Design a protein around this ligand. Structure first.
Ligand SMILES: Cc1ncc(COP(=O)(O)O)c(C=O)c1O
Ligand SMILES: Cc1ncc(COP(=O)(O)O)c(C=O)c1O
Lengths: 368, 368
């Protein structure tokens, strides 16, 4: 057992990529300012107003253009994938795949017997293909941030895609820049940049997406009610979800949105994650035992940093020692199979704590 | 405005039937003994051990027979209906319907194109048909407690059913008696007797149900991954869910389970809800402007009490005045259309508060 000196440790040891650091004062709202909301009806004003705070707050944070709406429903982003397969894809989609999450949505669409066989454009993990389109598709899909690899991809409507742009922003939303007008469905869950819990999905949708949802419904295509985007939309527009949402999840999410907006909005959040990730990547470049997994700097995520270790330094051992010292969730994505650490740098994470983390890793490695 | 005197008011004004009263000392564990779990990985030991506590606690509380397992996944009970339609029903089901929730499961199954047309046995709201079977079905389904009507139904395996017994216990589980051996899937969500949040479903499953899930999967039947019972089972057995669960929901749930077990278990909870409900129904009988909606006393739920009001006393006005005085969520189920109050009496609700509620109703009614 190596005991890392307290003086060099981060103030908060949570570097997980979802769930992720929930701020002390943010968690504290659950027993204070939100306490009276708990255990009260999602069909009555107090909880509906909370949903309204979330919707209005996200609309401000993301500078929603006219006609865009915040849609929400239980289940988390994984549920949204199945909902989108039923409800947003008409005939066929094109997917970019370059890691666990981008691949899994494509796979979900491939198996779903209500839509066509998707075009899948792949790259190796640590890279990404360019956003692109095809004449045969009506949805083009990729991930803003591939949480498994630490790759961030530009969110721009490809030339000649006059198709809905459907973006998995689960780990990107709230920490990376975005022009929402380039998107038609920009979806996420609360447990990354929003510093809340899983079990709810949120989707910012364009008028084109909303009209598409309505059109697909009018074909008679079956969808299980729980995965129904039509039903989610009708409820969301009246500050509700189809079935009962978690009040804690909404409360923590509202507090984080308010904090982000109060600190200067998405531009502040992006500067923050830039500060943090600059510290991580500069350190990884400086040390001879580390290197960023992502070789193209233009793809290096500000919010999830994947740092490979050379052969003779065992990152698994480093992660274990960190964990035993209260510095947690630096293990790489469980399926990736590399000698690597993965470090989250969502806005709740203090840039100084990322600096501290790197000093802790140096201290450990010197003593292996 | 009528200002109800403080001296006659309940200590806690939450009488909603889901979400429902969350005890303060329970909520306070989020900021103390559970605080370090927030924002940490559901694929690492601390949160897995929390899931383990929920599963083992439920196994104790419900006296699970050998081979029964606690299965869980995101989405709430409404998600479970769709998962069950895909994953538990082989060819055909029989449903009893007698209110919103029992009817909604039947409707979900009717529309699902992967199974046959269900047999539906109906009664008027306020009543229920008898648990029963049919030679052409392989699942028999009803609700332990129909939250929309205040009707509780026996949970017994019908004679000749030698079919899976699939019971919607969303508002019954934890507050009504049950012999789990009479069931094959006894499912619920945390926001009623368990005094936690929505967005998670739990299902106690028999060996027969688990083998059925496996057999259906082995046919190659497609299911969206989010609604996959095979996947939920695989994860549940290793203290996980398919996708990211809410730590607050699990933490509040675990605390409530521990509280129930520590007080004497299900037997204690049932004595408590009997005490509360006796106060409500006896009051309703005593007053000339009230009567229990459910005329058969054997169907009168111990946990959700529906009290009709005579024409000349406007229960809507009563509910509004109660609400304005902090006594909330006594409105009847939004779709039922009756001059009625609906009062929840789950174990977190103190019996003396139900008595206080009745005194508050009398005080208001005398001044209308
Ligand atoms: C990019 C991405 N997409 C989808 C998911 C699935 O999220 P959830 O667990 O909320 O379903 C995740 C994992 O959290 C993710 O990082
Ligand atoms: C008996 C019953 N079944 C199903 C549901 C659906 O529950 P959820 O909102 O968790 O999907 C409810 C409503 O909460 C209910 O009372």
């Amino acid at each position: 057992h190596l005991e890392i000196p307290t003086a060099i440790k981060p103030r908060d040891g949570r570097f997980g990529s979802g769930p992720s650091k929930v701020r002390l004062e943010q968690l504290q709202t659950l027993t204070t300012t939100a306490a009276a909301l708990f255990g009260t009806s999602h069909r009555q004003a107090p909880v509906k107003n909370l949903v309204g705070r979330v919707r209005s707050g996200l609309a401000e944070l993301f500078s929603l253009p006219d006609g865009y709406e915040v849609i929400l429903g239980n289940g988390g982003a994984t549920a949204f994938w199945d909902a989108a397969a039923f409800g947003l894809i008409d005939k066929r989609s094109l997917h970019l795949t370059y890691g666990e999450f981008s691949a899994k949505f494509a796979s979900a669409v491939s198996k779903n017997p209500f839509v066509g066989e998707p075009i899948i454009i792949t790259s190796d993990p640590g890279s990404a293909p360019e956003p692109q389109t095809d004449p045969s598709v009506d949805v083009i899909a990729w991930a803003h941030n591939e949480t498994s690899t630490g790759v961030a991809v530009a969110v721009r409507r490809p030339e000649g895609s006059d198709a809905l742009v459907v973006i998995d922003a689960t780990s990107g939303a709230g920490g990376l820049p975005v022009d929402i007008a380039e998107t038609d469905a920009y979806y996420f869950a609360p447990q990354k940049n929003f510093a809340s819990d899983g079990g709810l999905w949120l989707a910012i949708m364009s008028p084109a997406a909303l009209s598409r949802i309505e059109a697909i419904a009018a074909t008679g295509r079956w969808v299980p009610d729980f995965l129904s985007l039509p039903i989610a939309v009708e409820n969301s527009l009246k500050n509700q979800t189809y079935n009962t949402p978690a009040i804690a999840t909404l409360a923590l999410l509202a507090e984080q949105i308010d904090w982000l907006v109060g600190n200067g909005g998405l531009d502040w959040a992006v500067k923050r994650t830039a500060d943090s990730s600059q510290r991580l990547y500069s350190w990884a470049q400086e040390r001879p035992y580390t290197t960023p997994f992502v070789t193209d700097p233009g793809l290096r995520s500000q919010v999830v940093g994947t740092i490979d270790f050379v052969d003779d330094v065992d990152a698994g051992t480093v992660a274990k020692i960190l964990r035993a010292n209260g510095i947690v969730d630096t293990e790489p994505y469980r399926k990736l199979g590399r000698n690597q650490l993965r470090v989250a740098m969502f806005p709740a994470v203090e840039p100084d704590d990322v600096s501290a983390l790197t000093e802790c890793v140096d201290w450990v490695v010197e003593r292996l």
